[PDB]
Amino acid sequence: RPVEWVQAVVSRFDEQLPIKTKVSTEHNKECLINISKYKFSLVISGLTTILKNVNNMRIFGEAAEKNLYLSQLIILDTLEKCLAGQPKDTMRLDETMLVKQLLPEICHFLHTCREGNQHAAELRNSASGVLFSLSCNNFNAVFSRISTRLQELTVCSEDNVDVHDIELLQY
Amino acid sequence: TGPLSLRASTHGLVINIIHSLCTCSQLHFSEETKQVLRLSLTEFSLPKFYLLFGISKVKSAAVIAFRSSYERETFALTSLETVTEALLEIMEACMRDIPTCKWLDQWTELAQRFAFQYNPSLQPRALVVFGCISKRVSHGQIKQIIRILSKALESCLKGPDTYNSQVLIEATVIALTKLQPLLNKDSPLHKALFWVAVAVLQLDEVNLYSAGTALLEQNLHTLDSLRIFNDKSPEEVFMAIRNPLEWHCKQMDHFVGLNFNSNFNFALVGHLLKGYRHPSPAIVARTVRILHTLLTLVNKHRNCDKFEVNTQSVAYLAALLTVLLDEEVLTDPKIQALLLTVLATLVKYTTDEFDQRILYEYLAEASVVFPKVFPVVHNLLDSKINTLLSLCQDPNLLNPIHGIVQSVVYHEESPPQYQTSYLQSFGFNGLWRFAGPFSKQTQIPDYAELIVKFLDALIDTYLP
Structure with a gap:
């Protein structure tokens, strides 16, 4: 079935990211965008899965954080292009949990604070860009998140969730 | 036959025969005859005729003819054809000046007696010799050849040892190949043998495939020479001769999965598609010539030019395209589906860069x-494309692959319009099976009994 073909496409994009042949993976990336033009749901779900796995993966060594920086930059820009090219028509509706699955890593690993700014200042820029291009479609989940955390500010003054959550209102 | 010494002795015998044939005053030949015999002696001295005679690696036959003083290689009947034709040339050249020598009559009788009686060690060779030498043929002789073919088929079916009967089948086919042009044009057999040829192509044996292609080639050339194609298509006359005995052919078509009833030209291309998987390139070139002459006949029947894309001629163009696609031309879904299946088969089996590239760019x-x-045609390219999509680092191949992927992903809204089993709705199935590579077992497929019954019905209708 062609779903096996598209999953092979996404994995064929994927294997370069444990490493981090350039022209081949560039053609693969533009093919990813062309497929995400028609059906982006499974593409986005797979990209969330891959990005969550990569950022969740714990590796060490100077070349290892260089690899993480380069890989996360690549994933962020590819996700940005696929998110921007998605509305070929007026199709704004996305599943709320699919946004919510995308939500936490983007909302935290660049916006708990300025994280790795000497390398990840532009990563923060790219995260803000994908967050804007997401909230132009389905901001209502994020808006509900903002309301719920403000409600969560109940009593105790020992809360640092504002830099984690309220600052997201900026972008 | 035999060890090195006897084969070298046979070669020395041939050389001495020609040598004494030219250097004797008893025969008093002409000068030009002596010239052609002198040429023949030189051509037998060549290493090519060493390899024909089975002697390889040996510099001098005369040295090892006497080597005691001081079987591994197989034998192929085409070498015997070349040797017998050379000897026939020599014998003809010498009998031209000799009045009423009657040598050829004696040799034809000596061939006839050995060819038509049962002897497994000698009958395959005698059949080929009688084919090459004879200058006349009758209905009874060729029908005897067909009966011998049928009996060899039955013996190959019942017997575990098959090589001996296969050799006889191959010899039978090439004897038919040599004997067809001498036959009178009024015999319907001139057409009927065509079906016999494709029957051999169903027997998926390498030497049998080569012999069937040779029979088909000479049949097409001779039958074109007798001008039966002047007013009629290749479709019409062959279904006209296949009209009575079609029931057995209906079971045959059900088993092979290719119906000649619905689509004649796409049936023939499915058979001839196995030629590209033949190991020897000469058979490949012969199949290309078969496709070319059929394309010319089909196009000139409709009074168009060569390379003219239309309904009937699109399959030959698809087959020859490896060595445009107009929807307005091809409106029917069945024809365009079969056109797609041809390209899917050729991309599945062939694994060379240029052909898979040009076929992928056509397929996108x-x-x-x-x-x-x-x-x-999804499943026929389901794995291979994926494998390339995994490990093709060349952009030029993966770009049409990406185009195909995007084209299918866009058009996934309506699957149930057609399925991969739609080909089983009508007859055509296994067109990917029949174009597969040649099997190592090379065993004859049963339904060969149906071929036996088919040949028997041929004899029963046309001989008496």
């Missing part, structure tokens, strides 16, 4: 042109 366009019937 057909996905745009014919998206509804394009799922039918």
